[model samples]
Target: VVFYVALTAVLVAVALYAYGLAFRLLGASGPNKKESRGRG
Candidate 1:
């Protein structure tokens, strides 16, 4: 059914959300990152 096509698209969107959550929660900032960049 074409409804499955919509399901696939919805899963793709969830994939994007999952990836962002994982990335942000795990390491949005790397080991090399430091305090404020604009001012000291």
Candidate 2:
């Protein structure tokens, strides 16, 4: 039971980290420059 609770938390953390990485890639690649884009 407690294992499932930890699994759920880990899943959420992974999802958030993946999403953050994806956005960072898109921001860096698509924008062409870091300073060009204030927010992504």
Candidate 3:
């Protein structure tokens, strides 16, 4: 039970981080980000 809880917590954290990264990519505001050119 304790192990499953630990694993779940770890997975939850990873999921949240991935979600944040997805938004950052869409927003283009994360580390080393560059402004988008008009031409794409």
Candidate 4:
């Protein structure tokens, strides 16, 4: 019982972490595109 609850909590935390990382990568990509334009 307790183990199941702990597992669920860990899964939720990892999902949130991955979601934030994906957004960070997307945000970083946008700036790179604009920078490329500036260089051009």
- Which candidate comes out best when scored by TM-score? 1
What is the total number of backbone clashes in candidate 4? 0
Which segments of model 3 are wrong by more than 4 Å?
A: 1-7, 10-12, 24-40
Candidate 4 stretches greater than 4 Å from native: 1-7, 10-12, 24-40
Off by over 4 Å in 1: 1-12, 25-40
* Candidate lDDT (C-alpha), each: 0.46, 0.47, 0.48, 0.44
lDDT of 4: 0.44
Q: List, residue by residue over 1-40, the lDDT tens digit for candidate 4.
A: 5656764585654543454544444554332222211344
| TM-score between candidate 3 and the true structure | 0.27
* Candidates 1 and 3 compared by TM-score, better number: 1
**Model 1 agreement with the true structure over 1-40: per-residue lDDT tens digits:** 5756765685654543454544434444432223222454
Q: Which stretches of candidate 2 lie over 4 Å from their true place?
A: 1-7, 10-12, 25-40
Residue 4 Cα positional deviation in candidate 3, in Å, after optimal superposition: 9.6
How far residue 37's Cα lies from its native spot in candidate 2, in Å, is: 20
Model 3 C-alpha lDDT per residue in residues 1-40, reported as the tens digit of each score: 5656764585654643455544445545433333333554
For each candidate in turn, the TM-score is 0.28, 0.27, 0.27, 0.27
Reference-based lDDT, residue 2, model 3: 64
Summarize candidate 2's per-residue lDDT along 1-40 as a digit string, tens digits. Answer: 4656764575654643444544545554333223223365
Q: Candidate 2 versus the native: TM-score?
A: 0.27
Clashes of each: 0, 0, 0, 0
